[PDB]
Amino acid sequence: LEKLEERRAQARLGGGEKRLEAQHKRGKLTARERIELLLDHGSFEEFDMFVQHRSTDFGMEKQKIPGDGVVTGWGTVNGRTVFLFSKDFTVFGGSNSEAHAAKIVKVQDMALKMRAPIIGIFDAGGARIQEGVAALGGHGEVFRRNVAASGVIPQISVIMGPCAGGDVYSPAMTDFIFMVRDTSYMFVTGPDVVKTVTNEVVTAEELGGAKVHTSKSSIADGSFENDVEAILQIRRLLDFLPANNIEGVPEIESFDDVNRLDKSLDTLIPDNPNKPYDMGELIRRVVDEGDFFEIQAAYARNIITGFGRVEGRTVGFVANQPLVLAGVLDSDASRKAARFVRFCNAFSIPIVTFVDVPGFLPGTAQEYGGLIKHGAKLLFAYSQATVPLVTIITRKAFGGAYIVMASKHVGADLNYAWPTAQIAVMGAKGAVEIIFRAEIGDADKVAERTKEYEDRFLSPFVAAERGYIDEVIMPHSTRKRIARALGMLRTKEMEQPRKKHDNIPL
Amino acid sequence: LEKLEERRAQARLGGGEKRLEAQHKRGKLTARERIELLLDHGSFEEFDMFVQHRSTDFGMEKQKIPGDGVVTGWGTVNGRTVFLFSKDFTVFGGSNSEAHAAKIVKVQDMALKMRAPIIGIFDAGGARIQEGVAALGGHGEVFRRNVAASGVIPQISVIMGPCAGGDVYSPAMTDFIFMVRDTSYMFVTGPDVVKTVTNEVVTAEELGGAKVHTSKSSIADGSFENDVEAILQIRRLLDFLPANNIEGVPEIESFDDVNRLDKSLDTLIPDNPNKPYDMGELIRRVVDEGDFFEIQAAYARNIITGFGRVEGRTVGFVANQPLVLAGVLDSDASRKAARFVRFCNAFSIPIVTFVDVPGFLPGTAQEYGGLIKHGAKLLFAYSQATVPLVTIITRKAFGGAYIVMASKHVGADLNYAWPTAQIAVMGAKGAVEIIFRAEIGDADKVAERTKEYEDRFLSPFVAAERGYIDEVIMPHSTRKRIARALGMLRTKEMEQPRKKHDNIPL
Amino acid sequence: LEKLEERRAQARLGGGEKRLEAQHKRGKLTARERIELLLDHGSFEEFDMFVQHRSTDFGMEKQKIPGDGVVTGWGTVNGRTVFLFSKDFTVFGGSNSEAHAAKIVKVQDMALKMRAPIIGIFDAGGARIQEGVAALGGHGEVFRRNVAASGVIPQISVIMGPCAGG
Amino acid sequence: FIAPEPEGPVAHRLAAVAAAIDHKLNIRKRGISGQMRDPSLLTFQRERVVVLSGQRFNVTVDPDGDDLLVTFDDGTTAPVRSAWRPGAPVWSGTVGDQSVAIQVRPLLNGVFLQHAGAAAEARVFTRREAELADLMPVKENAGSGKQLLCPMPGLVKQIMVSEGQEVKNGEPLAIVEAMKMENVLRAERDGTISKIAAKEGDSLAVDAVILEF
Amino acid sequence: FIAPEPEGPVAHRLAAVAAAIDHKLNIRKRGISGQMRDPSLLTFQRERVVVLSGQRFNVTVDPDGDDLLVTFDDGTTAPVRSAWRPGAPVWSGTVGDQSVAIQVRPLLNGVFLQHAGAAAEARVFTRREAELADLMPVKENAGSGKQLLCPMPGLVKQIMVSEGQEVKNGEPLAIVEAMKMENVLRAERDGTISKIAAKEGDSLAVDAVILEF
Ligand SMILES: CC(C)(COP(=O)(O)OP(=O)(O)OC[C@H]1O[C@@H](n2cnc3c(N)ncnc32)[C@H](O)[C@@H]1OP(=O)(O)O)[C@@H](O)C(=O)NCCC(=O)NCCS
Ligand SMILES: CC(C)(COP(=O)(O)OP(=O)(O)OC[C@H]1O[C@@H](n2cnc3c(N)ncnc32)[C@H](O)[C@@H]1OP(=O)(O)O)[C@@H](O)C(=O)NCCC(=O)NCCS
Ligand SMILES: CC(C)(COP(=O)(O)OP(=O)(O)OC[C@H]1O[C@@H](n2cnc3c(N)ncnc32)[C@H](O)[C@@H]1OP(=O)(O)O)[C@@H](O)C(=O)NCCC(=O)NCCS
Ligand SMILES: *C(=O)CCCC[C@@H]1SC[C@@H]2NC(=O)N[C@@H]21
Ligand SMILES: *C(=O)CCCC[C@@H]1SC[C@@H]2NC(=O)N[C@@H]21
């Protein structure tokens, strides 16, 4: 009984006191400290605490550390069952091995079988070189289980240290990737190989740091100051998400009122059509208590995605941001919104869309980058959704951008419009230029026809007369209309035709 | 009876004799000529021949052309039912309208209901400006039906003319896009708006020509010299593809023999590890009669995708190309192979994979472009596949690239290896450097340990001893082993867990 | 903001004050009054309030009344979600047209999708003669929706006026 | 100039208000649906640590009917009564005997409180959470290179400052018009404008020099 | 130098062989599974058009049991007998009375045939297909520049050409080593080497100048 506790303490020591104090010196928590902070007090049950590797090459048999560089188990976050694994950087550098991957596979299998969220905490150095192809096989098993669990249970990856080589492909298939600034980085190939091949000198932070993956490469869904903040925000996020694709969104007691009006929204849209406004202000006015968990805030800032609550239930939000790039749709924003909409649809999360978009970003850079398929990704995600879709057009909706941004034609349930909405094929000037192309040399006649087109078509009423807009609502009633619409649409039933899977462009 | 035939002739005239002659002057066929060339002789039945638009704005009521700029209907290609629509460039420039989109919606609904392929021929000018938001609504309906039909029936888009604005988003979500060189182009935004906004002077060909979309942007799956060649190749591809996701691949009588050996394959792999070889030669020696329909041949040429036949049945092929970029995996190749594998799995097409890959492409350009998620796309597609998967490793399989390229660990059914295969975590030099970094200063010791590592681990037998490789086969029996394996695996049954859809990264 | 209120008031007037007065003279409520009486207080959300017909034959384009002769939407009856449409006898006699039937089809689709009861209030004069075979096509779409919803959601029809033809 | 850090009774009142807000939020949070078992079968930790901008308070929170009772290390107790609800910018109520109003702003894993001319970031942890948070390093900002670069291509609309003028943080510096939409640039540092490179009406490019701090 | 275009009996034999190959391929193709109705309930068009590298032959193909009979406009009939199967590089058989062997290289919508020193691209259409194909324009090659660029970064290892040497297409010009793999560059045009920019052992970036035509 005392020898068992002694063995437990020795296993908890991990790679030794020196490596633990080095980890703390870097400003990072240990794997067990991260697990303790993530879960409720006393709820953690650990699996495979005494697992050791069976490698006998290059003198590996002389160092057998229990746990083999990963801590696995399950617990509760706010009373709800979750599974998690945390790679121990002090044990062989956290490198993946056969038994390491076997423990991760066991925890993944249990999470999928019990229909519970699984959390991955990554602080490692890749795959163990001495293990050979067995580590690659274990990585492949982990990847296969990640693919199998996709769309069934939420998978969250927290990068709290180095992540290189084949390690990065496990978080990449999870739903959300979060990084810690200045201490974590991700790349398929390390700086040394980059120097030896491309003759380029970069550091780990420059190559794959948190800023790179949160603002450039679209890999990460967010970054945090340190480990404690990241783990607390993970706990906050878990309260938004369903446990699986069956139970639906969790519900809490809301302190907000669903019948309240916000008169400040009546003056949110500027009189000048060239003046931008903050759509995040509208989003935080609509959600309960102004609490909004934003996803990929630093990437593709011309669109906004994130989780809020309406009447105590999780609601996804997609909105164009006029403050960045005039709110146009480009490849980055399209891909970000498409991934968010696909996640929300997969887990039965209703989506509220605020539309203010003048079109797509022009130029050869967008066309050579595949803007066609990238925009088609968002169009595909919106047309594929069977969750409730509430769309509110605030200022602009022009042409294909109007079609893509959750219009009634692609399957939106309710489509509201503010009195300042402008739903048309294009602007009045370009429209009269295309239509009255013969009398282009005149000036007064062109101005008169432009004014006539502006008064006749750049309004929410041409679409309202065709039934494309369900109702033109006052801006101060936005939250009330959204709440009532979602309450009514909670019972929506809809299914796509039978298929193994769709062929959405990649 | 004579007035009906006169009306039919007037409708067949389209936009007039002068416009048809102008169309023929550019070297392009008319919509009806394209339909006649695509279908079997006398099999075309036309829908909505006399449909006219109902617009009354800007004097549109004075121009009522029957058909409204599109020819729709159904026919047979090699005796198999297909549906098709061909936009008529001589009628309002082929621009989409309410009745135009209604006809396309009818043909899409019939194609989805009959479980038959649908072919889209695009030669248009976007959406009709005078129609207003009704054209946008019709476009949205077409987009929704395109998304609904995805993964159920094969959708083929042939771009034989201009395609701009919201038009491009309908082909984008189809399975294959084919273009005609020097006469077709695709872009979301036209050159005039590009000049107005970005102050950049480009032509239609420079902005969205066939070469751009076949070699630079990944939009198109191929290009052809002219219209007749494109249509004949479309007929060939239709002969390759299944009618829907239920009937399976079509079967023909094969003139080739499944038991023949190819002694020339025994010397395909060069003795020098730095000498590349043509994997296309191996692919064309394995398929029946050397007939191989390649997909995206001009894009991401470090990997090869396309359709062949083994024993008269359609088989998909994915193979690394050592001739381009040493056969490494980058974002472009990963996305191309992932889309191909997703299409093949969606329609129950078995996939044969030839593996020769030293790893992934390094550098900041790949990491900043999202190499993590783009590479994970191919791994997701392979792990998600439930169709038969036969993998043959010829020369190299290093690190995570070995896992991605349809390894045993991600769900491959049979994994063969040539005697020249090298399955390891990395090269011998780097492995010795990592393992023996303490004594890296001794040149002779480093060389001796590198030789030992090369002899021990850079062989197909370490993986064979672990069961990762089913059999090491002689190169001359590759086709025989593949044919027997596919014949055995035809009865494979496997299913992913229940979900709305997966959350593959975009 | 004030122009939206003015447009809403003009749309609520239907086919004019005198036609509403004649409707009250017959002892009949208006379509909006019937909807208000049926649903809970303040629970009615209206769809397609500004929908207008697109017919241009026999001088129909000179009289475009918003709503096109039917009031559609959803509400709650005793706290439970219901969908309803009420034909407006003061707007073209309540006759079915293309946009009229389109609004009815929208409300039927929403009722079937949300698995909620749908209530039909009929006070009309058949199909609009000037709306050719488009009116018949809209009638057929409504019939198909009715057949599809049969046995899935309860369908209640209240005949509060003339109902003839199709 | 710089907001003073709360001291003495002001600090105690801010700590009590932060503890009460955290207690209310935790009580609401514990009512989430889908829990493995009944949340009533769990216990709330009385001992709490309140950190007010580098100042720790070891407090215990005990419910008393509707209001809370916050007890500090040195015997002092402070009942907290309020009708404040999350999302309300102002916290109004009584902390002990005095009636106070405190500005509440959202913060990551905490709240930002302003009261009696003092401002502090309030984070409430358990003892173990406080111990783990004490291990996190203090990270200092680097700053900008005393140059205002134009992040997007466009045309300069207006510049409201001249050379040799003092500008505080967040003050608008220039307006850039791109795709029929104005963009406002704000200073990320403090100092005097050395010189102005771009003039109003000029069509700048990506990462063009506008001014030097 | 340049492969002669077939003429006279050689052209007729090539046309007959192309027609026979097309007939065999069509017969195999018509037996595909999943057809709407029975393939036997359909007719095959006897009239065919064989376009032999800008030379048209109007032929009719009628199967003579195990053989094929091709009749031309001038009334000449050339029976065709062979055991050739698709994928075989050589077509061996008898065309009428003479026994011939023809090299078969497939191309898009046709085959490339070499026989008796003559080479021609053979495409077989119907009447309507030939009429539609006649509408297609003849597109000329745009050529290439006089500079040989380096498509990928790497190290130059070997150059087999020297100054003032005339080479034609399909000849190696340089070898570039990148990522432990060689890359052979081939000439896309013809021209004497006027100036060599890079030599062996020189590291070149992307699109670096190598040769001047
Ligand atoms: C991930 C990485 C950038 C971080 O390394 P780091 O943060 O500087 O920490 P270190 O380099 O000091 O390695 C720390 C320890 O972990 C061990 N380790 C890390 N990764 C390992 C792996 N994949 N296999 C075996 N051991 C590993 C090291 O041996 C070292 O042991 P030590 O403390 O006694 O020296 C670097 O270790 C790396 O690139 N590893 C290889 C991963 C990879 O595949 N990169 C792509 C190259 S193609
Ligand atoms: C597609 C496009 C590049 C090709 O134009 P083109 O090949 O040079 O042929 P044209 O410009 O001469 O237009 C041909 C005819 O079709 C008509 N047409 C083309 N597109 C049309 C549209 N979208 N709506 C209505 N009519 C259209 C033109 O009026 C013209 O009539 P005409 O023969 O009497 O002159 C150009 O027509 C276009 O961009 N159209 C708008 C589509 C779009 O949205 N582009 C993106 C801009 S943001
Ligand atoms: C239903 C019906 C018996 C009731 O008519 P009613 O109660 O006496 O009221 P009215 O006849 O005065 O018609 C009222 C108004 O609606 C209009 N209206 C009624 N039905 C209409 C229709 N089907 N189409 C167009 N307009 C119609 C009339 O023009 C009239 O306009 P008005 O007020 O300026 O005169 C009669 O209108 C009718 O039969 N309509 C045709 C419906 C039908 O198909 N009947 C079967 C014939 S086979
Ligand atoms: C004035 O310059 C009008 C041209 C700008 C129009 C803007 S640019 C981005 C949007 N895309 C598009 O086609 N129009 C919008
Ligand atoms: C000699 O230079 C060895 C370094 C090159 C290794 C090649 S480059 C592309 C592949 N990716 C990787 O990590 N190694 C392979």
Numbering used by the authors:
A (entry chain B), B (entry chain A): 5 to 510
C (entry chain F): 5 to 170
D (entry chain J), E (entry chain G): 454 to 666
Copied sentences from the primary study:
Glycolyl-CoA carboxylase (GCC) is a new-to-nature enzyme that catalyzes the key reaction in the tartronyl-CoA (TaCo) pathway, a synthetic photorespiration bypass that was recently designed to improve photosynthetic CO2 fixation. The enzyme forms an α6β6 dodecameric complex, where the β-subunits arrange in a central core of two trimeric layers, while the α-subunits sit on top of the core and face outward.
Besides G20R, we also identified variant L100N that showed a significantly decreased ATP to carboxylation ratio of 1.7 ± 0.1 ATP, lowering the energy demand for the reaction by 60% compared to GCC M5 (4.0 ± 0.0 ATP per glycolyl-CoA carboxylation). The L100N substitution is located in the periphery of the active site, at a position that had previously been targeted during engineering efforts of GCC M5, in which this position was engineered to be serine. The Asn100 substitution is in close proximity to His143, which was proposed to coordinate the hydroxyl group of glycolyl-CoA. This is supported by the fact that His143 is categorized as a rotamer outlier in all subunits of the L100N cryo-EM structure, which is not the case for the GCC M5 or G20R variant structures.
